[PDB]
Coordinates of N, CA and C in Angstrom, one line a residue:
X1 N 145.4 -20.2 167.4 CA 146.8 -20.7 167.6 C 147.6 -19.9 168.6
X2 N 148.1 -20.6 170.1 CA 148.7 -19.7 170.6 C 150.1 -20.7 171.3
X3 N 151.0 -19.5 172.0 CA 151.9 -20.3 172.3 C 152.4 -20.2 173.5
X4 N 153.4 -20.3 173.8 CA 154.0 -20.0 175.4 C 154.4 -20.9 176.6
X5 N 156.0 -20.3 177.1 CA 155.6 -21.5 177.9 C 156.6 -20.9 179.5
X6 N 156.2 -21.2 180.2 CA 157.0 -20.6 181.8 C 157.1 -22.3 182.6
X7 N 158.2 -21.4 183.2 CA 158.9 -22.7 184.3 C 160.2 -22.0 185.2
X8 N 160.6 -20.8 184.7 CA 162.6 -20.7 184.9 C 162.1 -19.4 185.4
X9 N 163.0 -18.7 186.0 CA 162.7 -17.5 186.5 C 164.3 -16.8 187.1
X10 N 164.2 -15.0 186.2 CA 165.5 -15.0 186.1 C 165.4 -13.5 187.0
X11 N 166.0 -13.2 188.2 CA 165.9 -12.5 189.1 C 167.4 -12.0 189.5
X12 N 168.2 -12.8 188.7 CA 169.8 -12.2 188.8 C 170.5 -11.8 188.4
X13 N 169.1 -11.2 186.9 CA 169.3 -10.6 186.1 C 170.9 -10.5 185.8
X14 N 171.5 -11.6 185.7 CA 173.4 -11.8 185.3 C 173.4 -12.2 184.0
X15 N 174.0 -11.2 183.7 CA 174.5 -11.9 181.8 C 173.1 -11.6 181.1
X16 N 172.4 -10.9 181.4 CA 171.1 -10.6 180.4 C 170.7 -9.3 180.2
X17 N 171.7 -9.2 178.9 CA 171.6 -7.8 177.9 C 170.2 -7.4 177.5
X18 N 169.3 -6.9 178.6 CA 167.9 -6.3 178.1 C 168.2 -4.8 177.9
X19 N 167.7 -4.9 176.9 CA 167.3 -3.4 175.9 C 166.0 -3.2 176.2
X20 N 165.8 -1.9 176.7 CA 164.3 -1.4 176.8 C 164.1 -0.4 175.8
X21 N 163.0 -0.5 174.9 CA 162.2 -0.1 173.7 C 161.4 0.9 174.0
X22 N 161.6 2.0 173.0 CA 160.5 3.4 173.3 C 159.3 3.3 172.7
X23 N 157.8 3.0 172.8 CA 156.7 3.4 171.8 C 155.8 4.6 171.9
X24 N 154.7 4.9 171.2 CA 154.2 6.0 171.4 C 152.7 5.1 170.9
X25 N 152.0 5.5 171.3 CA 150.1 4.8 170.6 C 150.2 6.5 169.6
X26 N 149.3 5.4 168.8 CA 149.0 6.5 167.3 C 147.6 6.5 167.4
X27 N 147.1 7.4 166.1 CA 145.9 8.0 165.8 C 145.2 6.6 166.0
X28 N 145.3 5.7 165.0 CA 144.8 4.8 164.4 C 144.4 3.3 165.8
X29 N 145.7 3.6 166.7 CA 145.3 2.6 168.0 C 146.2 1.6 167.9
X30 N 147.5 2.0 167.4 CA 148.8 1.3 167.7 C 149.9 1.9 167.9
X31 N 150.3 1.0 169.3 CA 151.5 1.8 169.5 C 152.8 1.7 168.5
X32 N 153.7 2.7 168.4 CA 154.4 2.4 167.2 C 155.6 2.7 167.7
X33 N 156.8 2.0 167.9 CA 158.3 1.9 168.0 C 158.5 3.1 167.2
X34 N 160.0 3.7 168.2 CA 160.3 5.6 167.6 C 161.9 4.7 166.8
X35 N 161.8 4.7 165.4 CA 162.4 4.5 164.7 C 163.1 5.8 164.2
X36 N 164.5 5.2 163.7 CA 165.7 6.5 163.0 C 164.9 7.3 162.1
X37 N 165.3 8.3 161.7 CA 165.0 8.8 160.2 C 165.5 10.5 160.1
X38 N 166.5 10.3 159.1 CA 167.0 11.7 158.4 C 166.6 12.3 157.5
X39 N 166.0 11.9 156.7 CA 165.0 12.7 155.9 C 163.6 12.0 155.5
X40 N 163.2 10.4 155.2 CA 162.0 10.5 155.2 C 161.2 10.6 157.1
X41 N 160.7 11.3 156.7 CA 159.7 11.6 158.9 C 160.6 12.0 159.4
X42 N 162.0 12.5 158.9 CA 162.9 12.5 159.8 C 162.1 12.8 161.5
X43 N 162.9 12.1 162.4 CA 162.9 11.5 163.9 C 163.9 11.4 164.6
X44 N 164.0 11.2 166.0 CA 164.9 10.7 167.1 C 164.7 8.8 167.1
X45 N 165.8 8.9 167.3 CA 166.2 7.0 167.8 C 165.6 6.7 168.6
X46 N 165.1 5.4 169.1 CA 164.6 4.7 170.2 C 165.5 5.3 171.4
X47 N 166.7 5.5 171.2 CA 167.9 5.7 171.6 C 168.1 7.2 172.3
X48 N 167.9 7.9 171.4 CA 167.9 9.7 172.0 C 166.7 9.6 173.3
X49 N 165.5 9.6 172.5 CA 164.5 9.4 173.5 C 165.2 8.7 175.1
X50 N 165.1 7.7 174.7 CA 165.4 7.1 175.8 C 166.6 7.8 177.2
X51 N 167.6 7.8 176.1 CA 168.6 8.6 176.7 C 168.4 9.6 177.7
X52 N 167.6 10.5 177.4 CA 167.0 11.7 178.1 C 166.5 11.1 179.3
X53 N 165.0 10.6 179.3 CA 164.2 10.0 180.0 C 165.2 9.3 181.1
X54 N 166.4 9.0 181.1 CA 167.5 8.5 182.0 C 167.8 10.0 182.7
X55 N 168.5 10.7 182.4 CA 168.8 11.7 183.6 C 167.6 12.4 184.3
X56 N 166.7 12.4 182.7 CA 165.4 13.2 183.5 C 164.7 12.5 183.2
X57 N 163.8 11.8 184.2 CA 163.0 10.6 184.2 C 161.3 11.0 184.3
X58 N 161.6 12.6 184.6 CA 160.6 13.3 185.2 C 161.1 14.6 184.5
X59 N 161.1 14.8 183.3 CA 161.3 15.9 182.4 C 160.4 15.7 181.0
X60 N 161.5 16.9 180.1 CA 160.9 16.5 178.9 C 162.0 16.9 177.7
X61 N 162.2 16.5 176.3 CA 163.4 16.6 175.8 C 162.6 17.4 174.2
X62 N 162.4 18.3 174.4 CA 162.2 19.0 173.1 C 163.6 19.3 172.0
X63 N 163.0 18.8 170.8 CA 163.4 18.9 169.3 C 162.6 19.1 168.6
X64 N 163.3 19.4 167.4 CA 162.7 20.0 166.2 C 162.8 19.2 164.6
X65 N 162.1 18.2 164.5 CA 162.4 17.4 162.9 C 161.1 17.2 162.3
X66 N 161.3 17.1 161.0 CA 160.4 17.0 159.8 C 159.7 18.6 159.7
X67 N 160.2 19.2 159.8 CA 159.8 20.7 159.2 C 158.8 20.8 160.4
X68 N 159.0 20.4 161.6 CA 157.8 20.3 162.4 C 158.4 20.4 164.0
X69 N 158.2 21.3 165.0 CA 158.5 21.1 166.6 C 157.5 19.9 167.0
X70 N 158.4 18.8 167.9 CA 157.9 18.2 168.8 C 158.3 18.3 170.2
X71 N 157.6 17.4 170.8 CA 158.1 17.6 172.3 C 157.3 15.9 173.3
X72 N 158.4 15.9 173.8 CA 158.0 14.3 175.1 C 158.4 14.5 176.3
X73 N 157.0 14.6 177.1 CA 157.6 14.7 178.2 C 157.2 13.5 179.1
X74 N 158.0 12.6 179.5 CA 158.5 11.6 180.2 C 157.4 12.2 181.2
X75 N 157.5 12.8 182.6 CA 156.8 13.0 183.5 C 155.5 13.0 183.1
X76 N 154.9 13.2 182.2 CA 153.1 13.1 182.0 C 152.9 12.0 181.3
X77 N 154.2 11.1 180.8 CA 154.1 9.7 180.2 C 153.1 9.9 178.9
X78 N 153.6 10.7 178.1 CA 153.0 10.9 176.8 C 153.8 12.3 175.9
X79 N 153.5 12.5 174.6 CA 154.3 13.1 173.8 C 153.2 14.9 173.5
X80 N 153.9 15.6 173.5 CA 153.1 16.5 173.2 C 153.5 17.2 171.8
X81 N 152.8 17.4 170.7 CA 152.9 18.2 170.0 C 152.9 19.4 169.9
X82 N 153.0 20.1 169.1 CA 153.0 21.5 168.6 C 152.9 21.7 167.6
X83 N 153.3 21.4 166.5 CA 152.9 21.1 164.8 C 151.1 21.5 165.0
X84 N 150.7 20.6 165.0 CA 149.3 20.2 165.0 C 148.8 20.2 166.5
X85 N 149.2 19.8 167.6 CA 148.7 19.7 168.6 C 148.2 18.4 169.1
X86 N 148.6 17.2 168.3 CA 148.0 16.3 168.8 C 148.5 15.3 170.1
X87 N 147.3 14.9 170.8 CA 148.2 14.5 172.0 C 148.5 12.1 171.4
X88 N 149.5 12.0 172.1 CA 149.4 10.8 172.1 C 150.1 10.4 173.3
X89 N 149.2 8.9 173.7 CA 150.1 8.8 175.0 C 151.3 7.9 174.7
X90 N 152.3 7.6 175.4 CA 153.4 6.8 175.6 C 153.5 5.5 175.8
X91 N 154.8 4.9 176.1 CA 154.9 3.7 177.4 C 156.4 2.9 176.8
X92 N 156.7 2.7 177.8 CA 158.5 2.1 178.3 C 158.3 0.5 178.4
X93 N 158.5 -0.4 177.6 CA 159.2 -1.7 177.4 C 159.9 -2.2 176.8
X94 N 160.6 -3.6 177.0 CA 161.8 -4.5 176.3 C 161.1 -4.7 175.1
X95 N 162.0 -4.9 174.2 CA 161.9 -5.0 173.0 C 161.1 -6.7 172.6
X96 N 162.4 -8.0 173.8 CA 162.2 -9.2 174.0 C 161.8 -9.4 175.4
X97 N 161.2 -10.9 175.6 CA 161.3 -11.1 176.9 C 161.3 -12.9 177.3
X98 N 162.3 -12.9 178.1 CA 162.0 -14.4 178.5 C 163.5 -15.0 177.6
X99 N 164.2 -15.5 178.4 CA 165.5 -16.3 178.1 C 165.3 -16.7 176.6
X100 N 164.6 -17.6 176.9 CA 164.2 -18.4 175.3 C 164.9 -17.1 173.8
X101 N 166.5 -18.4 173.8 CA 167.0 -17.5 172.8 C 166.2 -17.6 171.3
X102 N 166.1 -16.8 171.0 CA 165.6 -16.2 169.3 C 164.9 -15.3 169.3

């Protein structure tokens, strides 16, 4: 079962509120959306992340949550640990795509 469909093409980018989405790939081999959290995993927002990666596009924005140091640095386009050390890589896209409201 698949779907899809193209014809329109939107290059003047006017009036189209795109939100771009932060992921991270995991152990397991999915990438996983950086969701809120204050005490269970407590985490950074899709939002903080991102935020940074705007001034410093080519940096890196170290914090400290879940009883644990982490660290992302944008320029090597993947997350570095310290807790544990584990590496995972990154990547920057829209949440939605394509007019087609819903």
């Amino acid at each position: 079962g698949s779907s899809g469909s193209s014809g329109n093409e939107v290059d003047d980018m006017d009036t189209s509120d795109t939100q771009w989405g932060w992921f991270y790939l995991a152990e397991c081999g999915k990438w996983h959306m950086f969701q809120p959290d204050t005490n269970s995993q407590c985490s950074v927002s899709s939002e903080d992340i991102e935020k940074s990666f705007k001034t410093n596009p080519c940096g890196s924005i170290s914090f400290t949550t879940s009883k644990f140091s982490y660290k992302i640095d944008f320029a090597e386009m993947k997350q570095m640990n310290l807790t544990t050390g584990k590496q995972r890589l990154i990547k920057r896209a829209p949440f939605s795509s394509g007019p087609s409201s819903g």
